[PDB]
Amino acid sequence: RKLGYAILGLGYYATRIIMPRFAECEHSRLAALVSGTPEKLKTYGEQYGIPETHRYSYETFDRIIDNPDVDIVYVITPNSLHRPFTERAARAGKHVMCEKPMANTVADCEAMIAACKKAGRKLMIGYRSRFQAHNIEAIKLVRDGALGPVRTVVTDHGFTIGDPKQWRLNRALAGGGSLMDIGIYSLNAARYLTGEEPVAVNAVESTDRSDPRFGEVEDIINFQLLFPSGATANCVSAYSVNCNRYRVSGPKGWVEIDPATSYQGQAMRAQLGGPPAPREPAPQPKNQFSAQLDHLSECILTGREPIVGGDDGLKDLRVIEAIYRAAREGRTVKL
Amino acid sequence: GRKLGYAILGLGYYATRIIMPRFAECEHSRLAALVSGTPEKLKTYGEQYGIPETHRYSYETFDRIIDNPDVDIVYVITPNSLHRPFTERAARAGKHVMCEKPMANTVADCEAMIAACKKAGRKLMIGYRSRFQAHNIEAIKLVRDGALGPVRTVVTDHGFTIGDPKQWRLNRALAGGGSLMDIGIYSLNAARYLTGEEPVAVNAVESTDRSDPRFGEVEDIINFQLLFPSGATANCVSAYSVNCNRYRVSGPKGWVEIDPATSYQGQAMRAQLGGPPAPREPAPQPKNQFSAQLDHLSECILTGREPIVGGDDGLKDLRVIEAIYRAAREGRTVKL
Ligand SMILES: NC(=O)C1=CN([C@@H]2O[C@H](COP(=O)(O)OP(=O)(O)OC[C@H]3O[C@@H](n4cnc5c(N)ncnc54)[C@H](OP(=O)(O)O)[C@@H]3O)[C@@H](O)[C@H]2O)C=CC1
Ligand SMILES: NC(=O)C1=CN([C@@H]2O[C@H](COP(=O)(O)OP(=O)(O)OC[C@H]3O[C@@H](n4cnc5c(N)ncnc54)[C@H](OP(=O)(O)O)[C@@H]3O)[C@@H](O)[C@H]2O)C=CC1
Ligand SMILES: OC[C@@H](O)[C@@H](O)[C@H](O)[C@@H](O)CO
Ligand SMILES: OC[C@@H](O)[C@@H](O)[C@H](O)[C@@H](O)CO
Ligand SMILES: OC[C@@H](O)[C@@H](O)[C@H](O)[C@@H](O)CO
Ligand SMILES: OC[C@@H](O)[C@@H](O)[C@H](O)[C@@H](O)CO
Ligand SMILES: OC[C@@H](O)[C@@H](O)[C@H](O)[C@@H](O)CO
Ligand SMILES: OC[C@@H](O)[C@@H](O)[C@H](O)[C@@H](O)CO
């Protein structure tokens, strides 16, 4: 039994990463395409055997309500378009998978959650790392007490962004700079490794406004989190260096992954009793992308809630607003 | 090769286990005298290292060292609150001074030490041995040569799981503070020598369980953020409840990291420059970091040059440390 996905926004992530991974799914299938580029509907429609009756533009998208082969709409557009396409998908009676970051603001996330609730449809955010073997192993080591109580999480995410004209460097479409796009991985990991929500936030921003890339959004914004248990996080978010890693540490030892949240190539190292050494995670039956897709399908089929629902996305946006505020006001912001 | 004579003062762990055995590889330095509050230590190490009784001093007879021309330098290796009084007395006795980190408990103390050595016309150096360590020298060189491009981030963590609750490091009066004074200072010092800059803004967060037998008086964790004039940033960890020793410095062209970074031995460097991350071996150094540190002061004295890690370097760390404690206390960005 497989639920049908409509993929909306046929860009790099949709076409290079997500659509090929339906091949390993057990409860999900590609059923429809939604695009603002007629040429893409033809190319990918022909490639994946999607009939013309199942190809939509953004103008005809609302007609998808009459297509019973579509159960889920997966929104993979620029960030500022997540809310209106999610709302339209909910009004078309479809369940929704929405890419991170959920939306530009807390208020926008709340609107999305309300729309899906009103429709009685499920909502999930594309935090694929929660289905990735090494990440699952790090969470397990923490929960099983192998580190003792978490004391520090040190995590850095960044890449050297290029073309100044791309939507990520356009405030109207991206909603912000590095923190919205890649810094969110540091924040999301701080939260799922501690299993807590932060109560205090520091931040420092640093952007060269003479750089042609950074006229509108931020380059570096680094932040500190304090959690109720006393756990702490030091996080890097950057558009001008390459990094992808975290280490979580307690009095009994530590575990790190570098790269941590990449598409592939994860490598884990741990210091648990003895000297630092590589550590293999427990095997997972499916890659992180197929696992994410099937998780939503399986939740709908069994009447359960996604482990990374709209509330997880909303909680990230709450802290993101606090981080921007702490950097603007130069003070510790309380949550 | 002329060798200047060292008087080692405060015969504790670092003095006896780490420093004194490393005079063997020195080329311009020799062990000439001992200063201790424990008579047994003066006998044991006096006999082991062939130091005549005429060159053994207590804290009571230390000032007499002014009359001993075999002693050029006094190396102060006591608890932190005693760095200033012994530095002052050494300067008064006409000796140059090597002083362990942290320089002293406060900025005011550091300034007084600098003034006292200035008045005596003698040189002052702080024991930042990492500046003489092969992998650290290599990271600095990569930055200075432009291999990374402009420095954008420094991420550095220093900590160890401290044990005995009764030791002087957990006593506020003797240590001046908790993890930041002892081990977090390596994160700070590295952020400064990797960027080559001084911070203009500081954030910090403290996390300490005061009901822990170890942490009634001093802090466990205090993490901090630094902003530099170039736009460079640093994220730093200081801890007494986890083990970490590392840094990565990154720019648009690539990055280099060392883990462990500032340990006695065992350093390993990895870099992402012309390709994917791979091991990198640093340029070899003639002597180990300890012997190199000892010889640096001696050579400075012999040639009339200033130490690369003089009193001003220790003072600049204490200025930022004061700002870090303030930032954590007040919950705000502190401007420097
Ligand atoms: N979870 C992960 O690991 C990743 C998540 N993402 C997320 O996926 C989303 C898309 O990122 P990515 O796929 O890299 O971006 P791309 O620019 O590669 O694709 C964006 C697509 O969105 C559609 N779109 C609709 N309106 C616009 C517009 N005004 N300007 C540009 N594109 C528009 C287009 O599809 P059409 O031509 O079909 O209309 C376009 O190709 C973002 O939210 C990003 O955060 C991205 C990469 C990895
Ligand atoms: N650069 C580095 O890598 C390191 C630097 N250090 C620095 O060296 C200094 C000493 O550290 P460490 O050697 O580990 O400390 P220890 O406690 O092992 O030795 C301290 C010594 O100072 C003397 N002393 C004088 N007054 C007192 C007092 N009131 N209470 C205790 N001891 C006293 C004693 O020597 P006696 O019995 O001869 O009087 C004692 O043995 C500190 O400033 C520390 O930061 C320490 C370790 C590593
Ligand atoms: O088109 C949406 C439809 O309502 C379907 O997805 C139901 O949720 C069904 O329960 C599938 O299991
Ligand atoms: O890692 C996926 C991330 O969600 C994506 O949005 C970034 O832009 C990409 O990593 C660029 O490297
Ligand atoms: O497929 C590789 C595997 O996922 C990874 O864990 C490595 O085996 C480990 O990093 C040792 O190289
Ligand atoms: O947004 C919260 C959650 O992710 C979502 O699945 C709701 O529980 C559902 O919309 C209720 O009908
Ligand atoms: O060399 C590290 C630091 O300088 C030292 O003071 C530490 O506390 C010691 O390693 C443990 O006591
Ligand atoms: O403290 C600054 C420096 O370390 C010191 O060596 C002075 O330059 C010297 O005391 C002047 O005589």
CA A21 – CA A29 distance, rounded (Å): 10
Residue B193 to residues A34, A121, A146, B56, B202: CA-CA distances in angstroms? Answer: 53, 55, 35, 37, 17
Q: Which ligand is nearest to the CA of B14?
A: 2
Same domain, A122 and A144: no
> How far is the centre of ligand 1, averaged over its atoms, from the C-alpha of A167 (Å)?
9
- A183, burial (CB in 10 Å: exposed 0-12, middle 13-18, buried 19+): buried
Of B91, B90, B96, which is closest to residue B124 (Cα–Cα)?
B96
**Strand A152-158 with A232-238, pairing:** parallel
Residue A142's H or E segment, with its range, is helix A133-143
User: Which residues, 6 or more positions from B147, have their beta carbon under 8 angstroms from its beta carbon?
Assistant: B253, B254, B256, B273
Say whether both A141 and A261 belong to one domain: yes
- Rounded Cα distance between B227 and B201, Å, is 5
d(CA A161, CA B174): 49
Ligand 8 surroundings by CB, under 6 angstroms: B 114, 117-118, 121-124, 306-307, 310-312
Query: Contact, B176 vs B318, CB < 8 A?
Result: no
For A264, the token pair is 């592939």
Cα–Cα distances in angstroms (integers) from residue B330 to residues A202, A229, B204, B323, B326, in the given order: 12, 21, 9, 10, 6
| Token pair belonging to B301 | 């004295």
Distance between CA atoms of residues B271 and B277, nearest Å? 5
Q: Residue holding tokens 């540091």?
A: A186
Which H/E stretch holds residue B130?
Answer: none
The SS3 of residue A121 is coil
Helix (H) or strand (E) holding A109: helix A106-119
- Chain B closest CA to A253's CA: distance in Å? 7
CATH of residue B149's domain is: 3.30.360.10
Rounded CA separation B289/B207 (Å): 33
Same domain, B98 and B180: no
Q: CA-CA distances (angstroms) from residue A205 to A20, A143, A246, A323? A: 38, 33, 20, 10
Tally the domains of chain B.
2
Beta strand spans in chain A (E): 3-8, 28-34, 55-56, 72-75, 95-98, 123-125, 152-158, 200-206, 220-226, 232-238, 243-250, 253-257, 268-272, 277-278, 333-334
Residues B182 and B216 in one domain: yes
Pair A262, A294 in one domain: no
CA A25 – CA A28 distance, rounded (Å): 6
* Residue B305, token pair as written in the block: 């040059």
Q: Are residues B169 and B316 in the same domain?
A: yes
- Whether the ω angle into residue B279 lies within 30 degrees of 0, i.e. cis, is no
Residues A292 and A272 in one domain: no
By C-alpha distance, which of B264, B265, B301 is closest to B29? B301
CATH number where B78 lies? 3.40.50.720
Residues B193 and B261 in one domain: yes
Question: B46 by DSSP, 3-state: which?
Answer: helix
Are residue B143 and residue B209 in the same domain, yes or no? yes
Q: Hey, which residues 145-204 in chain B have their CB within 8 Å of chain A?
A: 152-153, 155, 157, 159, 161, 201, 203-204
Spatial separation of the C-alpha atoms in residues B272 and A299, rounded to whole Å: 42
Q: How many residues does chain A have?
A: 335
User: Rounded distance, CA B159 to CA B137, Å?
Assistant: 22
- Closest-approaching ligand to the CA atom of B163: 7
| Same-domain status, B147 and B206 | yes
> A230 and B209: CB-CB below 8 Å?
yes
Q: Tokens 């924040």 appear where? A: A187
Distance of CA B125 from the midpoint of ligand 1 (Å): 56
Name the percent of chain B in helix, strand, coil, to the closest 5: 40, 25, 35
As beta bridge partners, residue A250 has: A253
CA distance B26 to B290: 9
Same structural domain, A300 and A232: no
Of B152, B157, B331, the CB nearest to A241: B152
Atom of ligand 4 nearest to the CA of A262: 1
**Does A171 lie in the same domain as A97?**
no
Burial classification of residue B261, based on how many CB atoms lie within 10 Å of its CB (0-12 exposed, 13-18 middle, 19 or more buried): buried
Domain hosting residue A191, numbered range: 132-278+310-335
B161/B319 Cα distance (integer angstroms): 26
> C-alpha B194: how far from its chain's center?
15
A232:B332 CB<8 A = no
With a 6 Å cutoff on the Cβ, whether A229 touches ligand 1 is: no
Return left, alpha or beta for B50; rule: phi > 0 is left, psi -120 to 50 is alpha, else beta.
left
In three-state secondary structure terms, B43 is: helix
